[PDB]
């Protein structure tokens, strides 16, 4: 009988594929392209969750809020934390949402720091080995290869942006999801709205970023695969700074497209963001 695994988003699901391979039955709740903060699970997701031998969720205020979907899911399914479902973010230095609006809440976009993605993967393989010790061999060899593949990319991101002047190191995305990236890789970031729970693209939010750009003008703006592009397109039209590239934050790309995995989305993000900020 195959181990039944449920991941909450395509990032976590892809991390689990990289470790488990063909040895598990994997279900991803939030489909590719959809927002993982406010996605509403479907009956098939409730069913596969209740029959899951292990569930992996992000935690740190992505889906585990008080009135959030995952908390309702595991409560209604009567699952126990650290026995059935596990937060793959356990063990990272948390960064909180600065906005006085989101008082005290945590920023969930930890995977944008590659070292946290390694922590995510280590937490995934830890529980896969504990519940399916038959395949401890394969989980460890895939984790070891995955961690190394991510470490090389991490060492690359540490010096990817050294050629760009400090007055032009600004990653501008629609959502303020780059906090862990900025801390880890020395590139400040700006946004329209801080988290997808807020209203996305108000005239004040747009006009504030317009003024922010006048002070620190980057060569390029960016837009996420999982957000409506019209807010960032208004900022781009008004500021005159073109959006250099689509980037990947809260979701991987569809099967077949560039960035259709966590590693590929990070290499894509490093490639495109370094390219755009140059000119």
């Amino acid at each position, epitope marked *: 009988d195959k181990l039944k695994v449920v991941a909450t988003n395509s990032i976590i699901a892809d991390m689990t594929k990289a470790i488990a391979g063909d040895k598990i039955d994997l279900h991803s709740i939030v489909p590719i392209g959809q927002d993982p903060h406010e996605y509403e699970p*479907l009956p098939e997701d409730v069913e596969k969750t209740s029959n899951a031998d292990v569930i992996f969720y992000n935690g740190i205020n992505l889906e585990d809020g008080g009135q959030a979907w995952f908390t309702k899911l595991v409560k209604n399914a009567q699952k126990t934390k650290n026995k059935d479902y596990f937060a793959v973010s356990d063990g990272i230095d948390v960064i909180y949402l600065e906005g006085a609006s989101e008082k005290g809440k945590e920023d969930p976009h930890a995977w944008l720091n590659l070292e946290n993605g390694i922590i995510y993967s280590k937490n995934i393989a830890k529980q896969l080995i504990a519940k399916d010790p038959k395949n401890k061999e394969t989980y460890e060899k895939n984790l070891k290869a995955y961690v190394a593949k991510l470490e090389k990319l991490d060492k690359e991101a540490k010096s990817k942006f050294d050629a760009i002047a400090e007055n032009k190191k600004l990653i501008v995305t629609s959502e303020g999801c780059f906090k862990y990236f900025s801390k880890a890789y020395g590139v400040p970031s700006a946004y329209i709205w801080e988290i997808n729970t807020e209203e996305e693209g108000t005239p004040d939010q747009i006009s504030s970023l317009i003024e922010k750009l006048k002070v620190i003008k980057p060569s390029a703006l960016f837009v996420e695969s999982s957000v*409506d592009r019209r807010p960032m397109e208004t900022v781009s039209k008004d500021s005159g700074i073109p959006i250099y590239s689509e980037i990947f934050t809260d979701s991987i790309a569809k099967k077949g497209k560039p960035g259709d995995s966590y590693y590929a989305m990070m290499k894509w993000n490093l490639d495109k963001i370094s390219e755009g900020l140059a000119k």
Partner: single-chain antibody
Amino acid sequence: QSLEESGGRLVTPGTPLTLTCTASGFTISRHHMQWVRQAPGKGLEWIGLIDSSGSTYYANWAKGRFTISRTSTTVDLKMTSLTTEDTATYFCARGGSMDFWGQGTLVTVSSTQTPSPVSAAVGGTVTISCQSSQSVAGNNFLSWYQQKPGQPPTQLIGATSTLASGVPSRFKGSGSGTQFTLTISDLESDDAATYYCAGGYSGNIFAFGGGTELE
């Protein structure tokens, strides 16, 4: 904040027709949308849903005669060949729990879950609307809806025990697996409505029970 259906009209059998659910005050790109019909006098019947990502699921009787598509602002229901038995009011409802519904558009064509009772009645006390399902649902995907006549359904309880915003604890939902129960205490004059029930199943199929009118 609002859903508005359009396109319904009176047609002959075999006439194709397309209905449109237009959203006002929010975007559809991040909500599941269901199409539900209700024949005159008869009860609520689920047709299908379009998942926010784009997947489509339909009832087993659709036979491919009803097709759902979505844009950033509208959801389409393309009926390819209408029969007189398709005479109904066609609603769109948002979300997996069908939180809020449109007013409905009327289509006239011209020339499973069983609630044990059809009716129940008290003055100011307590009534029970019960539910038997053929198969288990996820064990908790059951929802209760109140439908005052000539109005869209209002959702009362989602997930079988969880109240919706602004519904009193007076409405109590219980049950698990196949048997579910809606209990209404402190009965009021405007509790008079036909209380329906909707379950979600494996394969993302939804089904309403028959009515349970209340006095």
